[PDB]
Amino acid sequence: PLESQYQVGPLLGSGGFGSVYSGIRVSDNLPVAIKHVEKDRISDWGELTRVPMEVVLLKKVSSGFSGVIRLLDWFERPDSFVLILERPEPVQDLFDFITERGALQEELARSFFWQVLEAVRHCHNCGVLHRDIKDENILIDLNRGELKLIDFGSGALLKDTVYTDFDGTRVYSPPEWIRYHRYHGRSAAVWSLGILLYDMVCGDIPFEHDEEIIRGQVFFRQRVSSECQHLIRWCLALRPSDRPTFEEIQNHPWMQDVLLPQETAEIHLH
Numbered sequence: 001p002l003e004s005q006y007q008v009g010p011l012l013g014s015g016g017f018g019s020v021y022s023g024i025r026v027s028d029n030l031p032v033a034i035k036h037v038e039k040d041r042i043s044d045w046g047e048l049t050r051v052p053m054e055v056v057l058l059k060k061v062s063s064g065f066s067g068v069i070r071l072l073d074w075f076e077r078p079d080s081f082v083l084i085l086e087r088p089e090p091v092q093d094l095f096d097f098i099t100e101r102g103a104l105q106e107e108l109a110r111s112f113f114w115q116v117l118e119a120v121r122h123c124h125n126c127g128v129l130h131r132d133i134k135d136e137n138i139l140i141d142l143n144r145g146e147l148k149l150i151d152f153g154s155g156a157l158l159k160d161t162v163y164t165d166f167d168g169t170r171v172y173s174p175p176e177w178i179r180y181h182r183y184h185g186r187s188a189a190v191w192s193l194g195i196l197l198y199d200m201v202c203g204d205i206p207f208e209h210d211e212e213i214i215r216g217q218v219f220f221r222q223r224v225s226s227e228c229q230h231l232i233r234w235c236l237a238l239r240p241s242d243r244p245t246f247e248e249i250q251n252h253p254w255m256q257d258v259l260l261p262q263e264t265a266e267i268h269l270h
């Protein structure tokens with residue numbers, strides 16, 4: 001049924017997550033993305049039937065609308081799982097967008113960062129921790145100015161006790177992971193959000209090496225408002241408990257007067 005119901009297009013990319021192709025649902029020409037994950041490469045299984053955790057997590061968050069790319073269907077094969085995902089068109093991931101345009105104007109960063117926060121809050125509400133929030137896991141719908149989270153393959157069920165496993169991106173990983181191999185979900189997520197916001201407004205990540213992460217001293221190579229600097233330094237507090245909650249991030253002075261997605265695309269994307 002997979003082969004008949006979907007028309008496969010170019011390979012979009014491949015990496016730790018498997019291989020993802022552009023596709024079309026033949027029933028209604030809906031643009032889709034088709035993701036293949038080798039069973040041998042899945043270290044983390046769940047249940048609804050053994051499936052990749054990613055399918056569990058996506059089902060938990062794909063109800064209703066949000067800034068999360070929705071799981072439309074999945075299929076099992078002898079050696080792989082195949083996931084059918086939404087595909088916005090036209091689209092560009094945030095990594096490529098920042099690579100092309102450099103550091104983002106603050107008005108644009110504010111709009112993007114706000115939408116990431118809303119998406120992450122929605123995940124956490126649904127009982128899901130992404131654990132790999134970063135520029136290349138964020139898609140921009142270029143027409144609507146809407147951001148969408150992708151790749152839940154390092155994610156987990158949200159819990160209030162310590163995590164001692166981590167499979168995300170090291171340079172977005174918090175100091176408590178680097179030093180102790182332990183973190184709690186929400187505060188680790190806030191650290192990664194601080195890395196992301198710095199990335200947006202400076203056009204690069206703040207820390208390359210473990211020693212810099214642990215030192216946690218933030219230097220700005222680009223002109224950034226005092227206010228944006230303050231939010232970033234707050235998210236990147238060395239002690240997890242000195243970090244802001246999502247509520248405190250969204251009530252921060254830098255986060256006031258966000259543009260709506262559509263006006264963001266008119267001003268900055270069209």
Ligand SMILES: NCCN1CCC(CCN2c3ccncc3Oc3ccc(Cl)cc32)CC1
Nearest residue numbers: 012013017020033085086087095096150151
């Ligand atoms: N610097 C970018 C170079 N490439 C990096 C890989 C990228 C594929 C992204 N992708 C995805 C990647 C991993 N898990 C789920 C995914 O679900 C998607 C749904 C819909 C679209 Cl359009 C894309 C995805 C393609 C670009």
